[model samples]
Target: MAMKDVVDKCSTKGCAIDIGTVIDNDNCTSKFSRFFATREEAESFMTKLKELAAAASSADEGASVAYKIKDLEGQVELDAAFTFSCQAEMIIFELSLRSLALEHHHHHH
Candidate 1:
């Protein structure tokens, strides 16, 4: 397994180190699944795959990570609120939106 140190500092009062997976690590491979509210949202999200592809491509040299999109098909309820639940959902949603922007914002690299 390979790891990279993630240093987080929100303020002088808070500082911490987190070791995250390094893409090129032989024992590590990236895989994720997401559930969205509706098919419309999921279809709309399809247009944003470019961002995910780019992020994964650039995540590490020789890394084979892939980002996929999925839908919940409809709304569902969950119990118990966690501090980062909404934030995590929003992050995925934001990435989905970024993918939409990349659709027509084309240019040569």
Candidate 2:
């Protein structure tokens, strides 16, 4: 099977950074469903991510910035409670929004 097909089939179980045929049992949940196919592609994506964040922050009027991962259809407002972690081939973002009242108060202070 093609690498993309294999990756797609096992995406729920997880995949490898290099687009291998088999799912990574050790860290299936953390595997990247999408593969860059080349180092240059990966680097370009990383560059774009950084540039987007920079531009978004500049355009944002407040200290908090909202970011969205189009590929994953995920969005979050960046704040002190926001955190993220990356694996070799994938990135995960964690956002903790306790309450709108708290967030509003935090921004005001």
Candidate 3:
């Protein structure tokens, strides 16, 4: 298990965790915020986020191309949660795909 000073922190079960944000790629921006108090809560949040990453602005777009989230503010909680259990700070969600996740910018040039 990932042991640390604050490993056994607040919460009866897993440590507290806070996540509040989303990376928007298109004009159809969606700012969402949610605070998960458990590891399981965080897992489902991340999983659901990835699935709805490619949102739609117009029907023409129809979310045909798979767009990826460019930046996720304060993500230590997600990865770290997997490593172990711990509390985290609030995360601000920013939406802008300036890259293809492999580099920079998501729009077709």
Candidate 4:
């Protein structure tokens, strides 16, 4: 799956921000901003994110989610090293959100 697929899912999950803007692959990290509508939604989606990762069928398909909810410009970056499977990418919107939350913590402490 490609970046467009990831963006579509994000819209369905009530993310008002654009996916392309959030993701940046040139540097090997996919970034996302304004991902979730609310903090609760972010947390709930994050749990789903882990389940999806655990369900990965291949190493290439195993994309990690590193969350970073910074201001209203919240973002999540998928590493370019991680090749996403069709199902994996389909469910990646939640994964990106989860990644943002994780990044937030790492950045703060």
- TM-score for each prediction? 0.27, 0.23, 0.23, 0.31
Model 3 TM-score (2 dp): 0.23
Instruction: Point to the candidate with the largest lDDT.
Output: 4
lDDT (Cα, tens digit) per residue for candidate 3, span 46-82: 5544443423122342223222232344432333111
What does candidate 2 score on TM?
A: 0.23
Deviation in Å, model 4, residue 45 alpha carbon: 0.4
For model 1, the superposed segments whose C-alpha errors exceed 4 Å read 1-29, 58-109
**lDDT digits (tens) for residues 48-89 of candidate 1:** 443454433333332342444443336422111111122233
Give the runs in model 4 whose Cα sits over 4 Å from its true position: 1-34, 57-64, 73-109
* Best of the candidates, TM-score: 4
Question: lDDT for every model?
Answer: 0.35, 0.29, 0.31, 0.43
Looking at model 1, the pairs that clash are 48-99
Candidate 2 per-residue C-alpha lDDT over 1-109 given as tens digits, one digit per residue, 9 for 90 to 100: 6555443454465542233322223331221112344544444544434443333233333123223223322332222211122222222210111121122234321
Give per-residue lDDT, candidate 1, residue 59. 34
Q: In model 3, which residue pairs have backbone atoms overlapping below 3 Å?
A: 21-93, 22-93, 24-95, 98-104, 98-105, 99-104, 99-105
lDDT value for model 4: 0.43
**Which is the winner by TM-score between candidate 2 and candidate 4?**
4
